[PDB]
Ligand binder design. Structure first.
Ligand code: EAM
Ligand code: NI
Length: 109
């Protein structure tokens, strides 16, 4: 269990690393809907999620198991797929980062 959470933390650090920054950056911080002019964001997305929040939860030992961690990372991608039309660049970025996540998550100890 501790082992599985270390795997999860490893994945998190990878998603935040420079290697993936070209497509990970939209997911680093909470969506600032006002700043981006997205005045419908919080009406469509009722459970915002982002990598800084996942990191805080990991650092605070909020996550009790790998499934809980994965549900939050996946929620983050789902919010992007819900809000944005599927041909938008940010959706392509989400799909690429989700590929990174899913392939490594699958190597669960
Ligand atoms: C075309 C305008 N679209 C938007 O503003 C939606 C927004 N779109 C982007 C976004 C990201 C990358 C590109 Cl190339 C174009 C738009 C976005 C950019 C951010 O920069 C700090 C943070 C969150 C974002 N994000 C996420 C996450 N989900 N939808 C969006
Ligand atoms: Ni899940």
């Amino acid at each position: 269990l501790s082992e599985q959470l270390k795997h999860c933390n490893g994945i998190l650090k990878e998603l935040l690393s420079k290697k993936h920054a070209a497509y990970a950056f939209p997911f680093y911080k909470p969506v600032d809907a006002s700043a981006l002019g997205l005045h419908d964001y919080h009406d469509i997305i009722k459970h915002p999620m982002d990598l800084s929040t996942v990191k805080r939860k990991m650092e605070n030992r909020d996550y009790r198991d790998a499934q809980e961690f994965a549900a939050d990372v996946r929620l983050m991608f789902s919010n992007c797929y819900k809000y944005n039309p599927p041909d938008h660049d940010v959706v392509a970025m989400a799909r690429k980062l989700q590929d990174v996540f899913e392939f490594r998550y699958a190597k669960m100890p």
